[PDB]
Symmetry: D2
Subunit: 237 residues, 4 copies
């Protein structure tokens, strides 16, 4: 199976798989059962922003999410990612719906990774920033129901012609280039990601969420990963 590290914006509480009884943000290391969560006061229909940061010296994966006019939510987990992920990875965004649903619209996505070696300073870096997504966004690998270009946005899950979100949907977008997160000569490795999202639902119970993830380069959507599995995991182990 794939190897997944993710920060989840989980909109629907699945208490039998360890979710708290409210929408939450979480850090997922090879399991949908988060290693750490924090309460997230998700706002239906408002544009929010999530930030994810990590470096190989501190070995702490941290995330912060907020909305304008509102307090933030944050979560952190101590994990050496070089012991979890391979040296080369792909990065992406994933989202899903099940019998409960919501739009999983991405309005912007940015990412910066750095590998500093011991050669004279010696910086190696990758950076990308999307503030619009066109109909043929060639530097994105779209998987499942993910589409780009509708209103210049990235719609991770299926949305009908009228704008209504559909249930039983799963979609992901991965940056085309592989990303180097470890090197034998690296003295410090770091990454930061930011994305802005619009989660909207006609219902009082939206589902299922959006995640920023890092995976083996050949990662694909696991069979049956709609709903609670967020398009990331093949089961709830």
């Amino acid at each position: 199976a794939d190897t997944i590290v993710a920060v989840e914006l989980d909109t629907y509480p699945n208490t039998d798989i360890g979710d708290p009884s409210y929408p939450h943000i979480g850090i997922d290391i090879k399991s949908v059962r988060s290693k750490k969560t924090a309460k997230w006061n998700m706002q239906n229909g408002k544009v929010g922003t999530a930030h994810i940061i990590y470096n190989s010296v501190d070995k702490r994966l941290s995330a912060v999410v907020s909305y304008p006019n509102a307090d933030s939510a944050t979560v952190s987990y101590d994990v050496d990612l070089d012991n979890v992920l391979p040296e080369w990875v792909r990065v992406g965004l994933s989202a899903s719906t099940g019998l409960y649903k919501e739009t999983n619209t991405i309005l912007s996505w940015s990412f910066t990774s750095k590998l500093k070696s011991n050669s004279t300073h010696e910086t190696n870096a990758l950076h990308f920033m999307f503030n619009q997504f066109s109909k043929d966004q060639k530097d994105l690998i779209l998987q499942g129901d993910a589409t780009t270009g509708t209103d210049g946005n990235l719609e991770l899950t299926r949305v009908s012609s009228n704008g209504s979100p559909q249930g039983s949907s799963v979609g992901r977008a991965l940056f085309y280039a592989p990303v180097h997160i470890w090197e034998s000569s690296a003295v410090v490795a770091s990454f930061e990601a930011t994305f802005t999202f619009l989660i909207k639902s006609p219902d009082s119970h939206p589902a299922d969420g959006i995640a920023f993830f890092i995976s083996n380069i050949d990662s694909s959507i696991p069979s049956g990963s709609t709903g609670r599995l967020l398009g990331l995991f093949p089961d709830a182990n």
Copy 2:
């Protein structure tokens, strides 16, 4: 055939195809016969640096090359690249040798492209920086004789075990991700590239040169493009 825009660091004067009678830097638009050249005082065995810049407002492709302790050489050509290249391209480095030879070693390579739309500011960007190249540089598409990892460098053309450059060699490295240089909503598009190189030869007449190029995404080395054709063009038209 491929569509090529390139800045050439041409070390060997081929006067019958329009080269001046000395090493030179040139701007190549769909032909090895440069649209513009400038004299280049190439130094055998020294590390040099080339810079390339362009934006869609000014529509002028410019380049500067220098060595420490030395004056620079520069060349510019007015060209609307949106009338030459497709909307999506790949960027790369190419080099060749023929009966005359030289090492075509790249020590660093950086690139930044930006597409600013008319939406609130609205920046879209790609940036990469290589200051080392490992044995398995997965974000580089290596073509021909190009290799990475020998002394942490990118060797565009073949070098023997002892370090001697080989003749009749051609190699290229392209960044893995496609690059977006035009968009219908873009109000300004720009790119800048920098690379550091070491051209060394045991001979008084090194050949053939190194080029930074932009091409259709599916670009490949043209058959018979060793020597004077710089791994970029199928003929000298």
Copy 3:
């Protein structure tokens, strides 16, 4: 007197000093009488974005301005800025009103300057980005009526408690650090600036405009530079 290079967003046509008979964007080199202008379809009450770019190889100062859902306006002028400005400068934003008035609100401002020498690659750079302005923005030198912190914005000219713009006002904001735009070893120098603005007026004839400018480090608002002089020039010569 000060030495000023500016890109003006001129909202009021002063035909006796060479302005065209409509709102326009212009490039100003040591005079309020622009060396080059282009028609600007200014929209009262909408947030717009201006971009300014320049490099020492091409020696062309260019600007583009737009609004969402609208076409852009652009202007360019060939000028070697090293022949106009001193080696060290300050950069800023200026605005004014006269008997006619408007708000001159800045919502964001970013700037990047680079000096690349001939030493191994050798990059020198300054970058700043403001997306909010607090009450005590210590890295900004505020001049005249300029204030920060009202709604997290930079108000270049005076606005009343109720939000109405006031006439006969002039204000500027300069970044605190001096900026290096030339060096004897520089092989390429470049700068880019972006700002987002909101110009609103209760009147059918707003005045007078906003400009991005570059000046001697000790630049101050010239006496009597309200209205048509944009807080930049001491007279209309």
Copy 4:
């Protein structure tokens, strides 16, 4: 007195003030008596590179130092800098010698600070990079014996005409612009710094070291802070 946070590259072991019995890297919070140290295999006459990183979510100040062909040394300390430093600070480099001496040459210095608010994404940033220092580096506040321009470098402490380091010297360089490290709306604040240095001595016992520091904006060299006090502290408390 000033408020100082610093990462010290301490070349001389002063055991009575808590230094370990070997050259070391340390994190200093309001005292020359480091809160945390690690052994540093300092190499006389070789160019080395230090990296410093911090963010307000993790609240961990970390540093790594290395030389080409050598292993790194690293140190980390959990500290909420918003509880130590004021909201606005200046950043700089400091160095000293006493009866024992060394050159404290800086070859490059870069710094990036970011304040991300909860407004739509909302990035605020400062970045500077020096790869050369000229004779009149106006964006640097030089203090004490610090000079720029000799071989394009920043010499923190006094060096004679012949190149010999002098004892009883203290010098600092601070970036001219104040830096904003906290804001009421900031959801994440971060900074990273890098500098390359050349510490050389004719003696088997070099002294005293170089530090990257953050201080109140009006920070000045404390009286009698030569030698073991690194130009940062007024005493050894």
